[PDB]
Structure formats: C-alpha cells, structure tokens
Amino acid sequence: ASEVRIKLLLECTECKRRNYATEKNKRNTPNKLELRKYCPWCRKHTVHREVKI
Amino acid sequence: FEGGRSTTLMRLPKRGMQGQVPGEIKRPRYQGVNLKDLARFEGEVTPELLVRAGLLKKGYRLKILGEGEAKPLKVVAHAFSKSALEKLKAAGGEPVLLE
C-alpha cells in the first residue's frame, strides 16, 4: 500500500456491479485498468473497468 | 471474562438484523407439526384440538410438515409443506387449508 499504489475496484461494464477489488501503482499505470473478469451477476466473463475504490 | 483481554465472544462479529426500536414486529407464527404426530387423531383435526393436544401452542398458526405416515384425515391447518400435501392428498387424507 502507498499513496502511489492505491486500491481500486473493477466494476463490470455491463451489470455495473463492482465484482472485484485489487490495487495498482497509479504511477506506473495512470490508466483505468480494464480486464475481462467473470461477472457472477452477468454470469460470464466481461470487461471490468477500474472504478475508484 | 478472559483476564482482561478481548473475550472470545467479543472478537466474533455481529451477524444479522438485531431489530431496533420500537422493537419486534408481530407477524403470524407457524408452529409446524408433522403428520406422524397427527396419526393419534381420527378423521378431522383442528388447530384448537392440537392446542388441547399439547402440540399447537397458543398464538401460533398451524402448518403441517411432511413427517411420518400420513392418515386418511381431514386436517384443517393454516398451511402445509408441499410434502404434506403430497402424503396427505395421496394418503386419502383431505388437506383443507383454512384462513
């Protein structure tokens, strides 16, 4: 943890529910991460946008 | 007590609705019963008789639960397990829901 390595959620781009929580070094990755995670709600893998935790 | 440390009861988490003022909400209670106990009766059985039977406690609405050997009886309960309707209607008994 750090002020440079922040926490974050991963909303599903479609169900809009934050299904995952992880972290990043915002220094290294100044972009909102986006990763195909299994949306349990949508019940299928789906791109998840990095949402501010 | 645990010699001053945080007691094991307290290191555990609160779980569920604990209610708030003005407190609990009166809703109908279903003292579920089993056919195997109803076998001691004959023909029709009512909630009141079950109350006299020491089975249906007062202030409770009687549901039936699919336990024991059904009996070709006309029971009048506030509700039934689906298994209760299965045994009862299947065993010739008459599942008679009342209100």
Binding site: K7, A21, E23, I53 | T8, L9, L12, P13, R15, Q18
Partner: protein, 64 residues
C-alpha cells in the same frame, strides 16, 4: 432474580440443535483488496466454536 441473557452473545452466536455453538468466521469486515477469493469465501461461512468456549457461551444464553 432470574439470570439475564448476555445480549452481546445473542448478537453473535446461534446454538444449533445438537448443543453446538455457531457463529460467523471472523476477519472479513474490511481490508480485503489483498485477501484471496479462497479467503473471503471460506471466511464467509458460519462455523462451530471450540468445545470449552462454546460451553461458556451456552452458559451465557440460558434462555436459548
């Protein structure tokens, strides 16, 4: 004076049929960005306390 049930225990534990003592697994109220899905998952379920502690707790819930 009749005993008084320990309401702090009432809000944490349920006593099963077999006299067992049950309460939720601890450690998932917060700080979870790094915990494993295994971790949150298995911590997400109830469990039966240890024997003696459960016994004491049973003493705390007399009218249960």
């Amino acid at each position: 004076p009749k005993m008084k049930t320990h309401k702090g225990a009432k809000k944490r534990v349920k006593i099963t049929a077999s006299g067992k003592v049950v309460a939720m697994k601890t450690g998932k109220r917060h700080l979870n960005w790094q915990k494993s899905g295994k971790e949150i998952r298995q911590k997400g379920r109830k469990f039966v306390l240890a024997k003696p502690e459960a016994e004491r707790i049973k003493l705390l819930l007399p009218y249960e």
